[PDB]
């Protein structure tokens, strides 16, 4: 069991986008580069294609916390768009072994 205070949280997008862009994700703590989209983290679409568009990235989050993370529209470069106003949040639990978490980021 690694850091019991850190939980991996996957941020998934409900977005059937079809462009060559990518939805990155930054956060309210250094874990997500503090608040930089070019330092945040690009997400992937392994569970997103046509039937169910679900992006997501399991960005670790050390020290239980109602972290506040949001999405960003990142072009083939660091140019992007970002959180509307109401960003998202996650509460890192204190479970040893099952260090998993969830954050439903919507992009569509």
Swiss-Prot record:
Residue ranges occupied by any CBM20 domain in the UniProt entry: 1-108
Highest taxon in the source lineage: Eukaryota
Glycosylation sites: 2-3
Comp. bias regions, Polar residues: 96-108
Residue segments, region Disordered: 84-108
Family: Belongs to the glycosyl hydrolase 15 family.
Protein name per the record: Glucoamylase
Organism field: Aspergillus niger
Taxonomy of the source species: Eukaryota, Fungi, Dikarya, Ascomycota, Pezizomycotina
